[PDB]
Amino acid sequence: GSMKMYDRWFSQQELQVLPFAEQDEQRNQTWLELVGEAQQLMDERCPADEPRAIALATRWMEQLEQDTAGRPEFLTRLNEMHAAEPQMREQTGVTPEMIDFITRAFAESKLAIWARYLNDEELAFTRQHYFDRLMEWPALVADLHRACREKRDPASPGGQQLAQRWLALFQSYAGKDAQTQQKFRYAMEQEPHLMKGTWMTSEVLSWLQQAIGVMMRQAQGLPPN
């Protein structure tokens, strides 16, 4: 879209590190392709769980991660913009229904993988509750980036607050059975896609794993590390 649209959704400081504010002909072409291909799939009434939808959704999320420079606050801002900006459709062709389709297809791309790791009742719980708190993740990841950026101790009260927030979001879709949660950890160790579209860097993930280890540490038994 236009630089005027971005100017009213981002401050001047933010625009200096938002890649979308760069004029780049190849970035623009890729977005024309991603939007055009989404609209075509919707026009064919393509199911979100077909491979064509899964592929396109994966391409979108990787592009969005690059074009927000990995900043979850910027993903949040673009999410606000898509739903509120009056000339979103005229300027970009993006509609709330398109974003819903892409998000549902991206969910299906992960549920297809979890189907190989979970039994039937665990997979049904995760499908049912997948979206319950999905939208709370960007604000948590933003706070995780901030904790890591500010060198907060993962064992501080604020650090454990973040680990507790993570647990509540994770348990929202994984359930609360320790046996089931270990399947999710194994899957995440083996399946690189499950960590895509989370706006986590290696450093922030390391910070979170440390805070979780403190939270979950047992008095007896093999400890974390």
Side-chain angles (χ1 to χ4, degrees):
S2 70
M3 287 295 313
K4 269 194 269 272
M5 183 183 55
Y6 292 108
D7 184 46
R8 55 181 175 259
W9 283 94
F10 299 84
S11 72
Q12 217 59 40
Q13 164 59 62
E14 289 169 330
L15 290 176
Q16 295 301 73
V17 285
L18 181 72
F20 274 118
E22 303 160 12
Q23 291 179 336
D24 186 86
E25 290 178 353
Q26 285 183 354
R27 177 185 307 108
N28 299 350
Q29 183 60 34
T30 299
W31 274 110
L32 286 163
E33 297 167 346
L34 294 172
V35 173
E37 285 182 43
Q39 185 63 62
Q40 181 63 25
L41 295 191
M42 296 161 84
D43 286 353
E44 305 183 8
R45 299 183 189 108
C46 171
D49 65 1
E50 299 293 325
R52 282 191 311 171
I54 281 168
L56 173 59
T58 302
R59 294 166 51 197
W60 269 67
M61 294 305 97
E62 290 305 322
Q63 196 66 37
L64 280 173
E65 213 156 53
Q66 286 181 351
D67 288 345
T68 62
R71 309 210 179 186
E73 296 94 336
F74 285 177
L75 174 65
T76 292
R77 197 74 52 72
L78 298 173
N79 187 45
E80 302 164 17
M81 191 180 82
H82 104 271
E85 164 58 50
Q87 61 186 27
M88 191 62 194
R89 303 167 188 240
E90 287 62 41
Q91 186 67 243
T92 69
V94 172
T95 59
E97 299 71 30
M98 180 177 295
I99 298 302
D100 196 351
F101 176 69
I102 292 297
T103 302
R104 279 185 291 101
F106 196 65
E108 288 295 338
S109 76
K110 293 185 182 193
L111 289 164
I113 295 173
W114 278 314
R116 305 210 331 278
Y117 288 87
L118 310 175
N119 65 38
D120 293 343
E121 290 184 354
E122 293 160 337
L123 188 67
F125 185 94
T126 298
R127 173 166 297 275
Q128 182 169 358
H129 297 283
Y130 195 84
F131 299 110
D132 287 3
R133 309 188 63 170
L134 186 66
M135 287 307 101
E136 302 207 317
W137 283 93
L140 176 53
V141 178
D143 290 341
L144 290 169
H145 280 247
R146 171 159 63 101
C148 185
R149 168 173 77 251
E150 296 182 355
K151 302 180 193 167
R152 157 177 304 290
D153 200 318
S156 65
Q160 291 297 290
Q161 277 189 62
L162 288 170
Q164 290 287 341
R165 287 173 60 192
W166 172 87
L167 184 68
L169 295 188
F170 171 72
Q171 289 192 141
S172 171
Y173 70 82
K176 303 200 182 169
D177 182 2
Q179 166 75 0
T180 297
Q181 298 172 337
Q182 297 298 313
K183 302 183 182 182
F184 279 82
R185 195 157 52 81
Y186 182 56
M188 281 176 27
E189 292 173 339
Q190 293 300 319
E191 298 284 349
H193 187 65
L194 297 181
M195 289 295 311
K196 301 309 196 173
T198 64
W199 272 254
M200 302 272 286
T201 69
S202 173
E203 164 171 72
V204 178
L205 185 51
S206 175
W207 189 96
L208 177 66
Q209 290 193 274
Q210 294 182 73
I212 296 171
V214 170
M215 175 179 61
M216 302 294 283
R217 205 179 170 172
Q218 304 179 340
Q220 305 183 245
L222 188 68
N225 278 341

